[PDB]
Every structure is written in structure tokens, then in C-alpha cells.
Design an enzyme around this catalytic site. Structure first.
Site, PDB file in Angstrom:
ATOM      1  NE  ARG A 143     -31.244 -18.876   9.149  1.00 48.24           N
ATOM      2  CZ  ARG A 143     -30.872 -20.030   8.598  1.00 48.24           C
ATOM      3  NH1 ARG A 143     -31.111 -21.183   9.207  1.00 48.24           N
ATOM      4  NH2 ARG A 143     -30.237 -20.026   7.434  1.00 48.24           N
ATOM      5  NE  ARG A 193     -25.251 -21.443   8.620  1.00 52.34           N
ATOM      6  CZ  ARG A 193     -26.352 -21.476   7.873  1.00 52.34           C
ATOM      7  NH1 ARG A 193     -27.273 -22.408   8.084  1.00 52.34           N
ATOM      8  NH2 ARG A 193     -26.523 -20.594   6.893  1.00 52.34           N
ATOM      9  CE  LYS A 238     -18.082 -13.723   9.749  1.00 50.47           C
ATOM     10  NZ  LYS A 238     -19.507 -13.887  10.148  1.00 50.47           N
ATOM     11  N   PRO A 255     -11.883 -11.123  11.237  1.00 54.97           N
ATOM     12  CG  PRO A 255     -13.432 -11.818  12.803  1.00 54.97           C
ATOM     13  CD  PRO A 255     -12.468 -10.696  12.519  1.00 54.97           C
ATOM     14  CG  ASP A 257     -18.318  -9.816   7.409  1.00 52.09           C
ATOM     15  OD1 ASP A 257     -19.451  -9.628   7.890  1.00 52.09           O
ATOM     16  OD2 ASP A 257     -17.455  -8.912   7.367  1.00 52.09           O
ATOM     17  CG  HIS A 259     -21.251  -6.303   7.695  1.00 47.18           C
ATOM     18  ND1 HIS A 259     -22.086  -5.217   7.532  1.00 47.18           N
ATOM     19  CD2 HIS A 259     -22.040  -7.329   8.097  1.00 47.18           C
ATOM     20  CE1 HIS A 259     -23.327  -5.571   7.820  1.00 47.18           C
ATOM     21  NE2 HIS A 259     -23.327  -6.847   8.166  1.00 47.18           N
ATOM     22  CD  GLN A 276      -5.394 -14.688  -8.776  1.00 49.29           C
ATOM     23  OE1 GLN A 276      -6.370 -15.369  -9.076  1.00 49.29           O
ATOM     24  NE2 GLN A 276      -4.932 -14.608  -7.535  1.00 49.29           N
ATOM     25  CD  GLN A 304     -14.412  -7.233  13.180  1.00 46.94           C
ATOM     26  OE1 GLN A 304     -14.041  -7.658  14.287  1.00 46.94           O
ATOM     27  NE2 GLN A 304     -15.664  -7.333  12.764  1.00 46.94           N
TER      28      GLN A 304
END
Length: 314
Positions: A143, A193, A238, A255, A257, A259, A276, A304
Site C-alpha cells: 500500500r 497521513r 521509527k 528502526p 517496528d 517485524h 515495566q 537490521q
DNA sequence: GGTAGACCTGGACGC
DNA sequence: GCGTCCAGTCTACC
């Protein structure tokens, strides 16, 4: 013949090579993995997109990265243009050296890296990176890819047309800061957005000193840079990290997220300690980023990308 | 200082 | 077929 997207086989004379083994770069693992959202595999194994304000098609053989550019009589990319490609893929950074190091300090990484070689970081333009990732939050790559395409189509400079595809450069701050941009972006399906894009474009141009403010973060420190970016609407921790890692030369930015959280829990049995909360939150997300930095080092953001890309293939 | 909780938009299940 | 789940940021309270 001279029409449509080129292929290495069809227009031989229209391709220049750059020494680059698949072990140092795998287009199929880098271009569609959520770093840049502007590349398409128009022909099998051939990726086309905009690079340094021009349209390119890239393809590779075991030891070579073949490049072709569409500007002017069609000709081969010049050494200077090819150098634009080398910089974009940051080819001076030896991936085999990084993979060795990460695999040496992280047994799980080594296991995965063996099957996903050639995952490196693209060196992206600050503006494109900033707005593309603003469109990424709480969303999926597929998207996001469409949103970015429609945004460039509507507000970006028209470049060249291949087949029925018209390429557009990325929109300028002034264009994104224009009147009624938000409403237009909403009709383009960017959702909430849309406001973030307009709001952030205006904030940069008339509150932070403009483009110079952004490009300046490139010489600033990761901590400094990440701090300044969070000021912008739609830019949380992020997104700021994505920009630091992919456009501001902050290789240690990681970043965090969904994943990376799954990866951390499934592959390292990670759990927050200084926090915590047992789930994602500003504190735990921050802790997770530090965890990955302590694990991989100065180029943790790059490592990453290897696991993220490999986690995508599933 | 640290949280539940909406906030666009589909593709992907599950029933 | 239709109502969810899912791929971060902002913010109204505690």
C-alpha cells in the site's frame, strides 16, 4: 526495440557494467524490501526507477551489475552517471566484511545471513526518504508503494515515459507545502497521513529553516538528528530512525517496528528489562533499539535490514 | 512519566 | 460474501 523498458538482451549496446558480485548486492532483496518504494521489476530480473533525477533500469549477473539510463540520442551511462549508481548502493562499503563481523558476534545472524546475502543499505535523498516513511506508519509495503507513486505522480516533476509508465521525480518541499495538498492526498488514499505530509512540509519550510535544516542533520549526531526529526508531524521514533539510517548516514540507527519485535522475541528470546511494559511502547521500543546496537555494533541498522528482508520472505 | 485508543486503507483470513 | 486482524503516531487522562 527502442521503445519500452530496456532489457539487457534486447538493447546490448545500451548497458554499462559495474563490478559487483551477488554476494555484495541482491537487487531482488534490496529494492522491494521497504527501504525505497520507487523501484519496480517491470521485466523479470530488471528493476526500473528514479535515481539522481533520471530513470534507470538495473539488472545483474553473478559478477556484474548492469545499468542503463534514460535521459538526446540514447547512449551508455557515462562513468560519472555510473558513479551515481555506486553512491546510491554505497558500494564502497564491503558487505562481506560486515556479514563476517555480525555473524561472528551473533550465531543466529550467521545462520540467516547464509541464505540472504547481498542485503545492503541504499543511500537515499533526505526529502524522498522523509516523506516516503511518513507514509509508512501503521501500513504495509504494498500500500505504501502505491501511495508514494500517486504522490509523485501528482506533485513531482515529470521525467520520462516507458511503455505506459510515466516516471516522476520526487516532489519538492514547496510543492508538498502547497495549498490544498492535504485534501488532494486524501483523494489519493493516503488517509490521515495526508495531513502529516502537508503539515511536515510546511513545518520544515517555515519553522525549521527549510531544506538546509534537513540536509544539515547529515553532519549532526545520530542522537541530535533523531531528536530534531521527531519534531515533525507524523514522524515518531521509527520514522526518525528510518530517515537517520537510510538518508542521514547514521548506520547505527535501528528502526523498531512489528517485524523487529517478532524477530527479537522469536530469535533472541528478548524481553524488556529497564522497562515495566511487556509490549511495544516508547520505552520498550527504545530499549529494543539499544539491544540491537549492543548486539551488532556501529552498523546495527544495516544488520537490521538483513533480518528484516529475510523476515519479509515468509 | 507512562498508557489505552481512535486514526485511512485495503489484503488476508475465518466462519 | 461481511466483520476482524494487521501492516506507528498522536494524545487525552492517571
Amino acid at each position: 526495440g527502442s521503445e519500452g523498458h530496456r532489457t539487457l538482451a534486447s538493447t546490448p549496446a545500451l548497458w554499462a557494467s559495474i563490478p559487483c558480485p551477488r554476494s555484495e548486492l541482491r537487487l531482488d532483496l534490496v529494492l522491494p524490501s521497504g527501504q525505497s518504494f520507487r523501484w519496480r521489476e517491470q521485466s523479470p530480473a530488471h528493476w526500473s526507477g528514479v535515481l539522481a533525477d533520471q530513470v534507470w533500469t538495473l539488472t545483474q549477473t553473478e559478477e556484474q551489475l548492469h545499468c542503463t539510463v534514460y535521459r538526446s540520442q540514447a547512449s551508455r551511462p557515462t562513468p560519472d552517471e555510473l558513479e551515481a549508481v555506486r553512491k546510491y548502493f554505497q558500494l564502497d562499503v564491503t558487505l562481506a566484511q560486515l556479514y563476517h563481523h555480525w555473524g561472528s558476534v551473533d550465531s543466529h545472524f550467521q545462520e540467516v545471513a547464509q541464505k540472504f546475502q547481498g542485503v545492503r543499505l541504499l543511500r537515499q535523498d533526505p526529502i524522498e526518504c522523509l516523506f516516503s516513511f511518513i507514509c509508512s506508519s501503521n501500513n504495509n509495503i504494498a500500500r505504501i508503494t502505491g501511495m508514494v507513486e500517486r504522490l509523485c505522480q501528482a506533485f513531482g516533476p515529470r521525467l520520462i515515459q516507458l511503455d505506459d509508465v510515466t516516471y516522476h521525480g520526487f516532489p519538492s518541499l514547496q510543492a508538498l507545502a502547497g495549498p490544498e495538498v492535504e485534501a488532494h492526498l486524501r483523494k489519493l488514499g493516503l488517509g490521515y497521513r495526508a495531513r502529516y505530509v502537508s503539515a511536515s512540509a510546511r513545518a520544515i519550510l517555515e519553522e525549521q529553516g527549510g531544506l538546509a535544516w534537513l540536509q544539515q542533520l547529515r553532519e549532526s549526531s545520530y542522537e541530535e538528528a533523531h531528536k530534531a526529526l521527531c519534531i515533525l508531524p507524523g514522524v515518531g521514533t521509527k520514522v526518525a530512525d528510518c530517515i537517520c539510517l537510510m538518508a542521514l548516514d547514521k548506520p547505527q540507527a535501528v528502526p523498531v517496528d512489528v517485524h523487529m519485535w517478532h524477530i527479537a522475541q522469536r530469535d533472541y528470546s528478548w524481553h524488556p528489562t529497564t522497562s515495566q511494559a511487556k509490549g511495544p511502547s516508547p520505552q520498550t521500543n527504545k530499549e529494543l533499539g539499544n539491544f540491537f546496537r549492543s548486539l551488532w555494533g556501529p552498523y546495527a541498522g544495516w544488520a537490521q535490514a538483513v533480518l528484516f528482508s529475510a523476515d519479509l520472505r515468509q
